[PDB]
Design a protein around this ligand. Structure first.
Ligand SMILES: CC(=O)SCCNC(=O)CCNC(=O)[C@H](O)C(C)(C)COP(=O)(O)OP(=O)(O)OC[C@H]1O[C@@H](n2cnc3c(N)ncnc32)[C@H](O)[C@@H]1OP(=O)(O)O
Ligand SMILES: [Ca+2]
Length: 306
């Protein structure tokens, strides 16, 4: 018999791919939100779950394949499970040609420049990239969000789907200027506690799709959002919601470099510390959260520890 022939790792079985010039395939970092804590699937032989997205519109495509399957009652429906996390009635299953027709057609009217507000632009290896932002009230943004949303669960541990009806949500979209392909996205939250109003802005989910990582995007995208928030007088403080090891490292690298270009390198090189009211005034200037500010101060001290 051997029950391992019917058991498979959900991380190895689920193959995700973003399709543009060609399909670039990769594995998820996490599958437990969908296939359970053990991240194992029981009851299928030669299991292969294909999850693909158009590089521009992110139109989902699903295709589950297996050589055989168990007849037991409680054998999990691999396909149904995946679909439950994907946008309802927006996924093309099995019919690959139908999928291509759908997205090649949609690619015609698909334009984020007509509905979204541009936030910034930058260049990495000759190519231009644009950062746009939007709420989740309009149909277009809601549609795109429900398509890319699953990436948070597959690559960000402890992530959960946000409530799209909460008006405090605002997404930032990073795309290739000329090709309009979605490179990454960021869900942010404007909240306060106690003429115009003030708010604290926090980064909740930050994601650059796997085929585009390690190229400088996350840094540029982060810097674009921060610089944007710094310029917005209504934003009091900028904080990050439960960052992981990788994001902490990114947050720190860009924060350090921003403070240094402002000359803080030398300010924290004054052998007599500094006033509390001065540390407060500068923390407010930088809009950083106290915990982060103090960490940055610490890093800037051993850096130039004379
Ligand atoms: C609150 C938050 O949401 S926490 C959740 C964070 N999100 C995730 O973990 C989702 C999965 N991962 C991702 O979306 C991305 O990998 C992120 C957001 C973590 C980082 O985005 P990236 O676009 O890959 O960032 P970046 O391009 O700076 O990453 C590569 C690293 O190589 C360096 N680097 C920069 N350019 C290049 C390049 N061309 N080639 C190689 N390395 C490069 C960077 O300095 C960076 O920091 P590191 O050396 O300490 O690791
Ligand atoms: Ca928390």
């Amino acid at each position: 018999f051997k029950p391992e022939t019917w058991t498979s790792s959900a991380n190895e079985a689920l193959r995700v791919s973003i399709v543009g010039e060609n399909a670039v395939q990769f594995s998820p970092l996490f599958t437990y939100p969908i296939y359970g804590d053990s991240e194992k699937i029981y009851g299928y032989k030669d299991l292969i779950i294909h999850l693909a997205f158009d590089s521009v519109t992110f139109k989902p495509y699903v295709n589950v394949k297996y050589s055989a399957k168990l007849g037991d009652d409680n054998i999990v429906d691999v396909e149904k499970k995946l679909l439950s996390f994907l946008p309802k009635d927006d996924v093309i299953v099995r019919d690959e040609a139908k999928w291509v027709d759908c997205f090649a057609e949609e690619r015609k009217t698909h334009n984020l420049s007509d509905v979204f507000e541009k936030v910034s632009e930058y260049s990495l290896n000759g190519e231009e990239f644009v950062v746009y932002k939007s709420s989740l009230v309009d149909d277009f943004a809601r549609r795109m969000h429900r398509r890319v949303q699953i990436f948070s669960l597959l690559f960000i541990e402890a992530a959960n789907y946000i409530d799209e009806t909460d008006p405090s949500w605002q997404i930032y979209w990073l795309l290739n200027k000329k090709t309009k392909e979605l490179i990454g996205f960021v869900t942010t939250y404007k909240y306060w506690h106690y003429i115009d109003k003030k708010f604290r802005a926090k980064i909740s989910q930050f994601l650059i799709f796997p085929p585009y990582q390690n190229k400088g995007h996350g840094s540029c995208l982060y810097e674009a959002i921060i610089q944007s928030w710094l310029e917005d007088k209504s934003i009091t403080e900028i904080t990050v919601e439960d960052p992981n090891e990788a994001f902490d490292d990114l947050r720190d690298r860009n924060d350090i470099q921003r403070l240094r270009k402002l000359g803080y390198d030398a300010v924290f090189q004054k052998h007599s510390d500094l006033s509390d009211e001065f540390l407060e005034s500068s923390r407010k200037s930088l809009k950083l959260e106290e915990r982060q500010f103090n960490r940055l101060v610490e890093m800037l001290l051993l850096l130039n520890n004379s």
